Amino acid sequence: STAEPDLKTALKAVIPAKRELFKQVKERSDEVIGEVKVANVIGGMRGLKSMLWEGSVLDPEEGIRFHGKTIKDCQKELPKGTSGTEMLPEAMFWLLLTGQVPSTNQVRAFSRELAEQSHLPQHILDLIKSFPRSMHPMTQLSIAVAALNTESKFAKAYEKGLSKADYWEPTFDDSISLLAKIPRVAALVFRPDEVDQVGTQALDASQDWSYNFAELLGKGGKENQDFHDLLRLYLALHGDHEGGNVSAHATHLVGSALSDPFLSYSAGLLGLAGPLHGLAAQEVLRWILAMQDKIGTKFTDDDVRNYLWDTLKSGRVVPGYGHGVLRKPDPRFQALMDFAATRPDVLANPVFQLVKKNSEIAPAVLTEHGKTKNPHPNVDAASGVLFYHYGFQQPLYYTVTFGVSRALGPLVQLIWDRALGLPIERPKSINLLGLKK
Amino acid sequence: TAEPDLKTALKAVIPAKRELFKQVKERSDEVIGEVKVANVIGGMRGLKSMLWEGSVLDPEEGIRFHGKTIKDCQKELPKGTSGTEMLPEAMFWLLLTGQVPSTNQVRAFSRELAEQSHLPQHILDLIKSFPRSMHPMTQLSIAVAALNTESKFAKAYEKGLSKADYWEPTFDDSISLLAKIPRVAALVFRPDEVDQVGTQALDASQDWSYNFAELLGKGGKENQDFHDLLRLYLALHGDHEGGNVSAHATHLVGSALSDPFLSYSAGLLGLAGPLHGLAAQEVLRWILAMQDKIGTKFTDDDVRNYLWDTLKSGRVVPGYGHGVLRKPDPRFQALMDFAATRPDVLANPVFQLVKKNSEIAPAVLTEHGKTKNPHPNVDAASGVLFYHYGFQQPLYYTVTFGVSRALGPLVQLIWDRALGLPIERPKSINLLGLKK
C-alpha cells in the first residue's frame, strides 16, 4: 500500500524519548516541589501536586492545552471529517497519545479501524436487555463497559506472563477496542427498546467515529451534518483536562493495580456518575431555560443585568461561570461559540442568544458582586444549549455523551502509565486524632 | 431498656467526631510534610494526604482499629453462638462507632443482615446474562454496581436532602450492601444455581459468615471449623488504612457523591487488579510448588536450602516483606493462632510448610539482604487454610476478599458523608513540568 505509519507505530516511535525524559526526572527524585498542610488532608488533596498526567496542562492565561497546543491551534491543525468544519475526536486522540498532529490520511485509516472494531459480543447485548428501564443511564454505561473486560487482551496476556516493557501494547489494543465500542454501548443506553437492531447495525467503515455515533443515536444522514460537527467538536473538547478530575483520576488509580482498561474506565465512569462531577451541563441548561421563561425572547441588556442581580442577591450562583485559576473565558467555550457563529439557525435560536448575551454581561456583574473568582464562562455554559438546539432534549443523557468523550484522555494516560512502568497509586492515610496530636 | 441498635450507636458518636473535625480544621494552615518529585512519579507513596478514621498502621504492632490490636479484638469482640473466632459484624460495629458492642447488640445486627440479604429479580437476571468464563471479580463488581437501583442515597439526593443528613441514607445503603454481597458472591461461585441460591432464606439467628458459608454450599455442623476460619478471615481483611486501591477508590468515587453501591463497585474493580488482589493465590501456588520439590516429609534444613536456592536463582519469596512493619503481621499471627488449636490443620504438610517457612525465611531473607522487613504477612497463611478446608479454587479467593473489604471502606464512606468531606481532587503535572 501507499501507507503512512499507523497509530501504534507512531506511538512506538515516541516511547524511547519519553522513557529517557522519565529517567532524567527520576534523577531529581529528591527535589522538593511543595508543602503538605492539614488543609490538603481534610480537603480532598486540593492544591496538592501529586500525580502525573502527560497529555494536558491547564495554562492560567490560555486555558487547557494539549502538548502545548491551544484549542485554537487544534481547530486549525487537526484533520476534519470527509465533510464538515470541525476537528475530529480521533485526531485529538492521536495528538494526545503521540504528541503529534496526524495527517488526514492517518486519521482516515484510524477511523476505519475504529469502525471495524465497533461490534459487540452477544452477552453485552443480553446484559443491557436485563437492565430495568429506570436504571440510571450512567449505571448502565459503567456496567456495560466493565463487562467488556471479557474481551481484554491485557488481562489475558498478563495472566499468561508478559514482560513489563510490553505492558503498553495490549493496553493500547484494549483502549482502541473500548473506544471503538463505547459509542454503540452509549446508543443502546439511549435506545433501550432497540437493542437487537442498534446492537448489530453495520456501520459505514469510511465514516468518522462521531458520525457513526450519531447514526446509532438515530441522527445519521446528510440532513444532520451540523449536529455531526457539533458532536465531533464536543467529543474532542471534553476528551482530556488534566489528571485531577474524578473520572481521569479513578481510571488511573484502578489501572495502577494493573486492572485492564475496561475495568479501569468503568471506575472512571462510576465517578462521572457522581452528581458533583457529571451534572454541570444539565444545570446550566435548566438555568438558561428558567431565565428565558422569566425575561422572554425580547429583552434589554438591563433586563439581563437585573435578572443576574436578583439571582445573586437571593444567594444563588450563576452556573457555568467561575474558575480558581483561569483568568479568561474557557477556550473550549469559545470554540463552541465559533461553531455557532457560522450556523444561522443556531444564531436565530433565542436560547442560544441568551447564552451569548449572558456571556457579554454576567462577567462584569459577577465581578462587581465580588463573590466569584475569575467569573468567566466555561464550556458548560454552552454545550447543553447546543445539544438542545439539535433536538437532544433529554439532559439526563448529557453525562452519557460526556462519558464517551472522556474515554479519550484517561485511556491515553493509561497507555503511558504502562509504557513508563508507573507503580500502584498508594497515598498514606491518617486519622483526625493523628492530626490533632 | 433494649440496647441501642447500630444506627443509634452511630448517631450518638457523630457530634464528638464533628467537634474533633472542627478543631482539626482550625489548624488547617499547619505544615505537616513536603511533596517531592518522588511522590509524583511514585504513586504518592509515603505521602500523608488523605483521611481514614477506623484503622492506623503501627510500625511495631501492625494494624490497629481505634487503637486496638488484633489480639485485643480477638479478646473483646463477640463470637458466634458456636465457635472460637471474632465476628466480622462485630468488627464492623467497632470500626464504625469506635466502640465494642455487647454480644446482644451483635446478635440483633446479624439478624438485620440476614433479613436484608434478598436480591431483586433484575439482579438475578443480570447475573444469568454473564458468560461462564467472565472473570469472577468482573461479575462481582458489576452486580454490586447494578444494586444502585436500590440506593436510598441516590434517590434522596435527587429529591433534595440536606448535607447534614447525607450520612443516614449512606448508612442504610451500606448495611443493605453488606447484607447482600455474600449472596452475590455465592451466585458468582455457583452459576448453575442462581434461582435457588439467589432466593434461599437465611437463618436469622446465625451470623453473617455462617450464612455466607451456607450459601457457598458449606453449611452445617460438619463445616464448623471452616465457619470459624471464614469469620476470622472476613474480620481480619475488613480494613487496612485508606491507601490501598480498593479503600481509596471507594472513597474517591464516593467523594463525587456517587452512592455506596457505585462507590464500592469501583473499589472492587481495583481489587480485581493483579497488584492488589492476587497475593493469597500467589503464596498458595508457591507453597504447593515447594511441596512438589521437597516432599511431604521435610526437615528445617530442606526448607532453608529451598529458600536459598530460590533467592540465588533471582526469584522472590511471596508473602514476606513490608516497607514499614518491623514484625510479623498480627493478622498472620491470628491465622496461626486459629490453626494451633486444630490438630487436622497442624497435621497438614502444606500448613506445616507455611509454619516452617515462617520460622526460617526471615533470617534467610535478612542474610540475603534484598528484602526490607522480611516478616510474614497475612497472605502467607490465608490461602493454605482455605485450601485445607476444601476451598480449592484460588481464582475465587479475591471474591472472598471482596466480601470482607466491603467493611472498612463503607464505614469510611459513612464518615466521609457525616463530616461533609469534599470531592477528592489532586493536581496533576507533566514530566516536562517537573524537568524544567
Residue pair B251/B408 in contact by the 8 Å Cβ criterion: no
Q: Is B322 assigned a catalytic role?
A: yes
Contacts of residue B203, defined as CB under 8 A and 6 or more positions apart, other chains included, come to B114, B210, B211, B214
Q: Tell me the β-bridge partners of A37.
A: B31
A155 with A285, same domain: the answer is no
**Grid cell locating B242:** 485508606
Q: State the Cα–Cα distance between residues B398 and B143, nearest whole angstrom.
A: 15
Q: Tell me the β-bridge partners of A34.
A: B35
C-alpha distance across the termini of chain A, in Å: 70
Give chain A positions within 8 Å (CB) of B255. 44, 246, 274, 276
Q: What is the CATH number of the domain that holds A371?
A: 1.10.230.10
B308 with B178, same domain: the answer is no
A269 with A337, same domain: the answer is no
Instruction: Determine the distance in angstroms separating the CA of A413 from the nearest CA of chain B, rounded to an integer.
Output: 11
Residue B236, amino acid: L
Give chain A positions within 8 Å (CB) of B277. 257
Would residue A436 count as lying in a domain? no
> What's the number of CA atoms in the CB half-sphere (13 Å) around residue B390?
10
Instruction: Determine the distance in angstroms separating the CA of B138 from the nearest CA of chain A, rounded to an integer.
Output: 7
Domain that includes residue A222, residue range:
1-279+397-428
- Angle (CA) B360 B364 B367, round 5°: 145
B223 with B283, same domain: the answer is no
B304 with B178, same domain: the answer is no
Helix (H, G, I), strand (E, B) or coil at B56: strand
Q: Tell me the β-bridge partners of A103.
A: none
DSSP letter at B48?
Answer: E
Q: State the Cα–Cα distance between residues B38 and A26, nearest whole angstrom.
A: 7
Would residue A224 count as lying in a domain? yes
The residue behind cell 443556531 is A346
DSSP letter at B64?
Answer: E
CA dihedral A93, A254, B154, A189 (to 10 degrees): 40
Each residue of B273-304: b (16+ CB within 10 Å) or e? bbebbbbbbbbbebbeebeeebeeebeeeebb
> What's the number of CA atoms in the CB half-sphere (13 Å) around residue B342?
21
Would residue B436 count as lying in a domain? no
B127 with B16, same domain: the answer is yes
Q: What is the CATH number of the domain that holds A212?
A: 1.10.580.10
- Angle (CA) B11 A271 B150, round 5°: 55
B62 phi and psi angles, rounded to 5 deg: 75, -160
> What's the number of CA atoms in the CB half-sphere (13 Å) around residue B353?
26
A202 with A94, same domain: the answer is yes
Residue pair B89/B109 in contact by the 8 Å Cβ criterion: yes
Pairwise CB contact (< 8 Å): A428 & B243: yes
Count of domains observed in chain A: 2
Contacts of residue B262, defined as CB under 8 A and 6 or more positions apart, other chains included, come to A139, A142, A270, A273, A274, B145, B148, B151, B253
| Resolution for the entry shown, Å | 2.3
Would residue A208 count as lying in a domain? yes
What would the 3-class secondary structure string for chain A be?
A: CCCCCCHHHHHHHHHHHHHHHHHHHHHCCCCEEEEEEHHHHHCCCCCCEEEECCCEEEECCCEEEECCECHHHHHHHCCECCCCCCECHHHHHHHHHHCCCCCHHHHHHHHHHHHHCCCCCHHHHHHHHHCCCCCCHHHHHHHHHHHHHHHCHHHHHHHHCCCHHHCHHHHHHHHHHHHHHHHHHHHHHHCHHHHHHHHHCCCCCCCCHHHHHHHHCCCCCHHHHHHHHHHHHHHHHCCCCCCCCHHHHHHHHHHCCCCCHHHHHHHHHHHHCCHHHHCHHHHHHHHHHHHHHHHCCCCCHHHHHHHHHHHHHCCCCCCCECCCCCCCCCHHHHHHHHHHHCCHHHHHCHHHHHHHHHHHHHHHHHHHHCCCCCCCECCHHHHHHHHHHCCCCCHHHHHHHHHHHCCHHHHHHHHHHHHHCCCCCCCEEECHHHHHC
Q: State the Cα–Cα distance between residues A86 and A54, nearest whole angstrom.
A: 24
Pairwise CB contact (< 8 Å): B276 & A435: no
The residue behind cell 494493573 is A258
Give chain A positions within 8 Å (CB) of B30. 37-38
Give the rounded distance of the alpha carbon of A194 from its chain centre: 26
C-alpha distance across the termini of chain B, in Å: 68
Chain A: residue whose CA lies nearest to B27: A38
Would residue B94 count as lying in a domain? yes
Helix (H, G, I), strand (E, B) or coil at B33: strand
> What's the number of CA atoms in the CB half-sphere (13 Å) around residue B197?
28
Q: Which of A45, A129, A258 sits opposite B274 (nearest CB)?
A: A258
**Of A35, A45, A241, which to mutate for an interface test with B (greatest number of B Cβ within 10 Å)?**
A45
Would you tell me how many other CB atoms lie within 10 Å of the CB of residue A364? 12
A271 with A290, same domain: the answer is no
Catalytic option among B172, B225, B228, B379:
B379
**Of B17, B119, B252, B325, which to mutate for an interface test with A (greatest number of A Cβ within 10 Å)?**
B252
Instruction: Determine the distance in angstroms separating the CA of B355 from the nearest CA of chain A, rounded to an integer.
Output: 29
Q: State the Cα–Cα distance between residues B111 and B94, nearest whole angstrom.
A: 18
The technique is: X-ray
CA dihedral A174, A176, A178, A181 (to 10 degrees): -140
Residues of the binding site of A for oxaloacetate: 241, 323, 332, 406, 426
B379 with B404, same domain: the answer is no
Pairwise CB contact (< 8 Å): A52 & B430: yes
Residue pair A331/A72 in contact by the 8 Å Cβ criterion: yes
Q: Is B379 assigned a catalytic role?
A: yes
**Grid cell locating B224:** 464448623
A35 with A183, same domain: the answer is yes
Contacts of residue B34, defined as CB under 8 A and 6 or more positions apart, other chains included, come to A32, A34, A35, A36
Residue pair A142/A266 in contact by the 8 Å Cβ criterion: yes
Q: State the Cα–Cα distance between residues B168 and B414, nearest whole angstrom.
A: 8
DSSP letter at B67?
Answer: T
**Grid cell locating A278:** 457529571
Would you tell me how many other CB atoms lie within 10 Å of the CB of residue B217? 12
The residue behind cell 438591563 is A302
Would residue A388 count as lying in a domain? yes
Catalytic residues of A: 277, 323, 380
- Per DSSP bridges, beta strands A56-59 and A428-430 are unpaired
Contacts of residue B19, defined as CB under 8 A and 6 or more positions apart, other chains included, come to none
A32 with A163, same domain: the answer is yes
Instruction: Determine the distance in angstroms separating the CA of B381 from the nearest CA of chain A, rounded to an integer.
Output: 22
